[PDB]
Every structure is written in structure tokens, then in C-alpha cells.
């Protein structure tokens, strides 16, 4: 392809339907987006296990063999943003102890198996942006106590079950904006700490989520494009660190005199 002095080989621009053969087992990064890899062969990456970034994008990746990712203990960032694989790969992923960023957003995702995200201990960010999910994965997320960012942006989630985000105490920023959340239970966020950003932008909420006051750390709070009529008095009480509340584009009726104190 095109080797770089930074050990960042970019093979985007060959259109090849397999892994780049003959490449030195010394490279660190690998970018392949122009090409179309309809299937990842078994142990196709055994040649160069000394990589840390794997930019596999835009490929119509429909299948990835369970053993295909074995032995990549030096991999740090895995990017699979635009693909066609349906279910989250729970067997290919399981076996990575140095992975920090798992991007699986554009590939349509209807289901996610229970044992998914097992053994991952260095995960800090993972994207699930545009894929038709309907239930927030509770047990699957319970195995990730070390992440600091999680986006569920474009899905068809309906509601957040109680204690759906409990184990991942080290979370920082959450995104749930452009889906269609209908109502939240009053214990959905219980257990979340040092959370800063929370987005509920376009999901139409009924009246107001009272579960916000469960987190003592909070700086932003995005809920604007939804349909909120009345904000109850003293709603922003347990979160005295707010600095930006996006509440435009709501048919508000009665904010209430006691609605903003010591912010």
C-alpha cells in the first residue's frame, strides 16, 4: 500500500477485498476505508500483531470470524463505524485487554447478546450512534466499569429501565438525544456519578424526568427538542454544578418561581 515513517500504513485506495498481505509486521496503524471487505477471514491479522489502531471503515463487513481478532493484545483503538454487520460481535471482541475505543455506530444493530463486552477492562469510549436498538443493554453494559463516554444517539429506544446504568460508575458523558425515549423511571440514573453531559434532545418526554436529581455532579443538561409542558418547582436541586441548560423549543407552561437556586 503506502507505508509511512510513523508506521501508519494506509491501504484506502486499493479496493481490495481482503487484508493487506505482505505488509511489514512492524506497523502500528492501519487505515482501510476505500476498499470493500465483505468478510473478515479467520486469523487474517496474525501477520502483523504489532498494531494499535485499526481503521476499518465503510467496508460492507458482514461477518468477522471469532478467531480473526485473536492475538491482537496491542490493539488500542478499534473503529468499525460504517458497516453492515447486524449483531454486536461478542466472540470476536472478547479477548482484547488493551482496547480503549470501540466504534460501532452506523452498522445496523437490532440485537446485542447478553455475554457481550466480556473481559474488556481498558474501554473508555464506545459509540452506538445509528442502529435500530429498542432496549438499553443493561447486563451487557454492566461488564464495563471503566468507560468514560457512551452514545446512543440514533435509535428507537422507548424507555430507560430502572437501574439500567448502575455498574458503570466511572461514566462522564452520556448521549441519548435523537432517539424517541418516551418516559424515564425515577431510578434510571441511580448509581451514576461524576457525570457531566446528559443529552435528551429530540426524544419526546412526557412531563419531566425526576431521575436527574440522583446525580450530584452535573454541568450540562440537554433537553430541548422534546415536548415538556411544565417544569416542576425545585427540579434542579440535587445538581448544583449546572452551567448550561438547553430548554428551548418546548411548549412550556409554568416554570415555577422556585426553579433556579444557587446554580
Amino acid at each position: 500500500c503506502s507505508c509511512d515513517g510513523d508506521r501508519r500504513v494506509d491501504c484506502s485506495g486499493k479496493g481490495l477485498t481482503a487484508v493487506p498481505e505482505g505488509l511489514s509486521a512492524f506497523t502500528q496503524a492501519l487505515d482501510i476505508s476505500m476498499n470493500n471487505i465483505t468478510q473478515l477471514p479467520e486469523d487474517a491479522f496474525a501477520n502483523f500483531p504489532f498494531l494499535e489502531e485499526l481503521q476499518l471503515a465503510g467496508n460492507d463487513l458482514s461477518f468477522i470470524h471469532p478467531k480473526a481478532l485473536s492475538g491482537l493484545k496491542e490493539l488500542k483503538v478499534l473503529t468499525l463505524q460504517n458497516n453492515q454487520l447486524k449483531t454486536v460481535p461478542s466472540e470476536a471482541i472478547r479477548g482484547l485487554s488493551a482496547l480503549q475505543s470501540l466504534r460501532l455506530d452506523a452498522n445496523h444493530i437490532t440485537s446485542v447478546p447478553e455475554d457481550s463486552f466480556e473481559g474488556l477492562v481498558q474501554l473508555r469510549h464506545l459509540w452506538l450512534d445509528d442502529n435500530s436498538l429498542t432496549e438499553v443493554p443493561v447486563h451487557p453494559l454492566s461488564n464495563l466499569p471503566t468507560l468514560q463516554a457512551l452514545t446512543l444517539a440514533l435509535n428507537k429506544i422507548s424507555s430507560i429501565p430502572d437501574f439500567a446504568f448502575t455498574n458503570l460508575s466511572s461514566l462522564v458523558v452520556l448521549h441519548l438525544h435523537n432517539n424517541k425515549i418516551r418516559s424515564l423511571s425515577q431510578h434510571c440514573f441511580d448509581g451514576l456519578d461524576n457525570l457531566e453531559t446528559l443529552d435528551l434532545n429530540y426524544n419526546n418526554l412526557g412531563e419531566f424526568p425526576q431521575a436527574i436529581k440522583a446525580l450530584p455532579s452535573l454541568k450540562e443538561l440537554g433537553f430541548h427538542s422534546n415536548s415538556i409542558s411544565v417544569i416542576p418547582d425545585g427540579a434542579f436541586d440535587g445538581n448544583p454544578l449546572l452551567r448550561t441548560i438547553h430548554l428551548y423549543d418546548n411548549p412550556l407552561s409554568f416554570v415555577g418561581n422556585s426553579a433556579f437556586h444557587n446554580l
Partner: nanobody
Framework: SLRLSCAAS????????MGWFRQAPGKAREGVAT???????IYADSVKGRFTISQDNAKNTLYLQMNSLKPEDTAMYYC???????????????????WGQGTQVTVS
């Protein structure tokens, strides 16, 4: 009207979520029939009443029988198995750890 047998030698015993996958040459691969250790089977919409699935834990051998052959059914069929439990069954390729070499199947 074919016999598709999967000689299970990978694990030692206790089969779990034995499933058959047909692969189309250019598209993804999806399941057609999956049985569990208890014997419960899950087919697809285009398979219920057309094919079947048979598995014996005594000889530890997976059997697949085709019926009502049709031209669209011709594909590259694969055998899949799972050892570690903890996942609900279903026609999904993300939950199986061992994949057979696969056989190409036509109609006549």
C-alpha cells in the same frame, strides 16, 4: 433431500446452541435452524415446515435434512457450535465460537 452432517470434534461433550448457517456469495450469512442442549429448536420464516434439524447427544453428531428443494435455497452452508453457555439461543452469527469449513449446496 440432502444429508448435512457436522462431525463435532472441537469440544468434548455437552453441545450448546448447535446451528446451521447458509451464506450467500456476496451477502451476509444467517441462521436457518438452531437447537439447544434441551432440544428446543428455532427455525426461520422460510424454513418452518420446509427443513428440519436433528442432533443426538449420544454420538455427538449434527444432522440437517433438506426438503422441498427450491432454486433460491442454493448457497454455501456452514456448521456452528457453542461451548460456553450464558446466551439465549437464536439465529445469530455473533454468538458462536466454532465454524465449520462449510459445504456448497445446489438443487436438482
Amino acid at each position: 433431500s440432502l444429508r448435512l452432517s457436522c462431525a463435532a470434534s472441537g469440544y468434548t461433550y455437552s453441545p450448546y446452541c448447535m446451528g446451521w448457517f447458509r451464506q450467500a456469495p456476496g451477502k451476509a450469512r444467517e441462521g436457518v435452524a438452531t437447537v439447544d442442549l434441551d432440544g428446543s429448536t428455532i427455525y426461520a420464516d422460510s424454513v418452518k415446515g420446509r427443513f428440519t434439524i436433528s442432533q443426538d447427544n449420544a454420538k455427538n453428531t449434527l444432522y440437517l435434512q433438506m426438503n422441498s428443494l427450491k432454486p433460491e435455497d442454493t448457497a454455501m452452508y456452514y456448521c456452528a457450535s457453542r461451548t460456553r453457555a450464558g446466551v439465549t439461543c437464536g439465529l445469530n452469527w455473533a454468538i458462536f465460537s466454532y465454524w465449520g469449513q462449510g459445504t456448497q449446496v445446489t438443487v436438482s
